Amino acid sequence: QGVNCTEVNVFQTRAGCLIGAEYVNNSYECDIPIGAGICASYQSIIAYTMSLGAENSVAYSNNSIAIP
C-alpha cells in the first residue's frame, strides 16, 4: 500500500506496486477491486485496466425513429 518498491513480475500502479501478477493490454470485466481502476482476476493471476462496459455506439439523425 503506497510503497515505491525499489527497496524490497513486478508491476507499478497508482495504489502501490503489485508482485506476482502480470499486466494485460486488453480489458476484461473485473470482480476484485484494488484502487485506481486496476482490477485483478484469475483466467495465472492477471491484472488489467477496468472494463468500463461495451463501447456501443448509437446512430443519430433528425428524421430517424426506432420502434420496438
Partner: protein, 404 residues
C-alpha cells in the same frame, strides 16, 4: 400564456476520502515496549481495522452505485446540431486532454504517521466517461435506454414527449422552437456564469473535504499531547525514568491515544453513514430524474420537471435540472359546465374559459383557445343537479356537414 425555462443546479456528495489506520505504527511507532504493552489491552486493533475497511468498502459501493447504472458506454455523435439546442457547455471537448467539459472543469477548479489514504477505485477519467455516456444516452436516445436497448429518437420529438408528460399537448413546442432554443442557450450560459460567481455555491463538497481534513489533522495533532504524563515521546520516558513509573506513564499515554483513536473511528463511522444516506438519495435522483421524467413536484428543480443532466464533480455529483416555469399569467372568467339543449357538457381534458363575450376551451397550463366542439366534450346528467352552469351553444360538425 407564456413559459420560461430555468436551469437550476443542486449538489450532492457521493463519497468522501477513504481512510485506513495502523494500530502499532500510530500508537507506538518504533518502541517495542509499547508493542508488548498493547497486547495487554486485548483486541482493540482488529475491531478498528475491520470497521475502517468496512467504511472503505461501503464508500466504494457508494461511488459505484450512483454512476454505474448503464451497461454500455454510449458515444456522442461528432455533429453537434440537434435542432437549435447548443449542447457545447456540458458535452466533453476533445481539445482538453482530460476529457473534461467546461462545466466539469469549472467544478474541478473550485474544489481544493500511520495514516495512509487509499485511492478510490474509480478515478476521475472513468467517472467522467460514465457521465459522458449518461449525457449521450439522455441526449440522443430519450429515456428508453434506461430500460432496454437504446433507440434513436430526434431531440425535438422527445422534447415534445416530455411536454406531453406534464399535461401540455405537443402543439406548443414546434411553433416557437427558436424561442425555446434561445432560452435554453441563455439558461446554460447564465448557469455557467453564475456557478462560479459565489464561493458558497459549492458548499457541501468543500464542507465534507474540510471536515475530513480537519478530523485527520486533529488525529495527527493528538500525538503531541502529554495526556498527564511527563512528556509525549516514547523514547524520552523509557530512557529517563525507572520502569515502575515508566509503566504507569506509558499506560496513561496508551489509554489516552486509544481513546482518541476510538473517538476518531466513531466520528468517521457517523460521517460515512450520513454520506451513504446522501449517496442513496443521489442514486435515486440519478435513476429517476436523468434516466426518465419524474412527476413529483419540487423533487428535481423548482417547477415542473422536463429532464436533467449529470456532471462529474470531485467527491460528489452535480445536477443540472431543466425546469418549466409558467410565468406571465393572465386571468379570465370561467364556469364548470356548459348547458346546451337541456343536457350538461363537460371538458374532456381542459377547462372552459371565457374572455368576457365568447367562450373557449383550453389546456390546463397554456392559453391556447379553441372553439367548443362535441368531439372534445362529453355529456352526463341534466342541467339541474350541476351548480354554476352557464347557457351557451356548442359547435357540432354534423350540422354544416350534412346539408353540404
Amino acid at each position: 400564456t407564456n413559459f420560461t425555462i430555468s436551469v437550476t443546479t443542486e449538489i450532492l456528495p457521493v463519497s468522501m476520502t477513504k481512510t485506513s489506520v495502523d494500530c502499532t505504527m500510530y500508537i507506538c511507532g518504533d518502541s517495542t515496549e509499547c508493542s508488548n504493552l498493547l497486547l495487554q489491552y486485548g483486541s482493540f486493533c482488529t475491531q478498528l481495522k475491520r470497521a475502517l475497511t468496512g467504511i472503505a468498502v461501503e464508500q466504494d459501493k457508494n461511488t459505484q452505485e450512483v454512476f454505474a447504472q448503464v451497461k454500455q458506454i454510449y458515444k456522442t455523435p461528432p455533429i453537434k446540431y440537434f435542432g437549435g439546442f447548443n449542447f457545447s457547455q456540458i458535452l466533453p471537448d476533445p481539445s482538453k486532454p482530460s476529457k473534461r467539459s467546461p462545466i466539469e472543469d469549472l467544478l474541478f477548479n473550485k474544489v481544493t504517521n500511520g495514516l495512509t489514504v487509499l485511492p478510490p477505485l474509480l478515478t476521475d477519467e472513468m467517472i467522467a466517461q460514465y457521465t459522458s455516456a449518461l449525457l449521450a444516452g439522455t441526449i440522443t436516445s430519450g429515456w428508453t435506454f434506461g430500460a432496454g436497448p437504446a433507440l434513436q429518437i430526434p431531440f425535438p420529438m422527445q422534447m415534445a414527449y416530455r411536454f406531453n408528460g406534464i399535461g401540455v399537448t405537443q402543439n406548443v413546442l414546434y411553433e416557437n422552437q427558436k424561442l425555446i432554443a434561445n432560452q435554453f442557450n441563455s439558461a446554460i450560459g447564465k448557469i455557467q456564469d453564475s456557478l462560479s460567481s459565489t464561493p458558497s455555491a459549492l458548499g457541501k463538497l468543500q464542507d465534507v473535504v474540510n471536515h475530513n481534513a480537519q478530523a485527520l489533522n486533529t488525529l495527527v495533532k493528538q500525538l503531541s499531547s502529554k495526556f498527564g504524563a511527563i512528556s509525549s515521546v516514547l523514547n524520552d520516558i523509557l530512557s529517563r525514568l525507572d520502569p515502575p513509573e515508566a509503566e504507569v506513564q506509558i499506560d496513561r499515554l496508551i489509554t489516552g491515544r486509544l481513546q482518541s483513536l476510538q473517538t476518531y473511528v466513531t466520528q468517521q463511522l457517523i460521517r460515512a453513514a450520513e454520506i451513504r444516506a446522501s449517496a442513496n438519495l443521489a442514486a435515486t435522483k440519478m435513476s429517476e430524474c436523468v434516466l426518465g421524467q419524474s412527476k413529483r413536484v419540487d423533487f428535481c428543480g423548482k417547477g415542473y420537471h422536463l429532464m436533467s443532466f449529470p456532471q462529474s464533480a470531485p467527491h460528489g455529483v452535480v445536477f443540472l435540472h431543466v425546469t418549466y416555469v409558467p410565468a406571465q399569467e393572465k386571468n379570465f372568467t370561467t364556469a364548470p359546465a356548459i348547458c346546451h339543449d337541456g343536457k350538461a357538457h363537460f371538458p374532456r381534458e381542459g377547462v372552459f374559459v371565457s374572455n368576457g363575450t365568447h367562450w373557449f376551451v383550453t389546456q390546463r397550463n397554456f392559453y391556447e383557445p379553441q372553439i367548443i366542439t362535441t368531439d372534445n366534450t362529453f355529456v352526463s346528467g341534466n342541467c339541474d343537479v350541476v351548480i354554476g352552469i352557464v347557457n351557451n351553444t356548442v359547435y357540432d360538425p354534423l350540422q354544416p356537414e350534412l346539408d353540404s
